């Protein structure tokens, strides 16, 4: 699902995150930056679980709760 | 001290 890249919004991890399942989630450390990509799950469902590309390139899933958004 | 994760469907 497309969207305008200037309306993009940036988060923080606030901690660490282990990845249960790598094939859909990424690692997150506390403080690294990442971009949203997406706050549905992979069926277009609202989702507590956020699709987003993190500063070493890796895309994939993360807690929303365990993030900040950057505004 | 670490949140609660939320369920996941997979």
Known sequence: ?71 | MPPTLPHRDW
């Open chain 1, 1 to 71: 699902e497309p969207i305008d890249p200037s309306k993009l919004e940036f988060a923080r991890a606030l901690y660490d995150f282990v990845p249960e399942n790598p094939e859909m989630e990424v690692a997150l450390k506390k403080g690294d930056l990442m971009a949203i990509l997406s706050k549905k799950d992979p069926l277009g469902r609202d989702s507590d679980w956020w699709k987003v590309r993190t500063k070493n390139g890796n895309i994939g899933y993360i807690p929303y709760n365990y993030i900040e958004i950057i505004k």
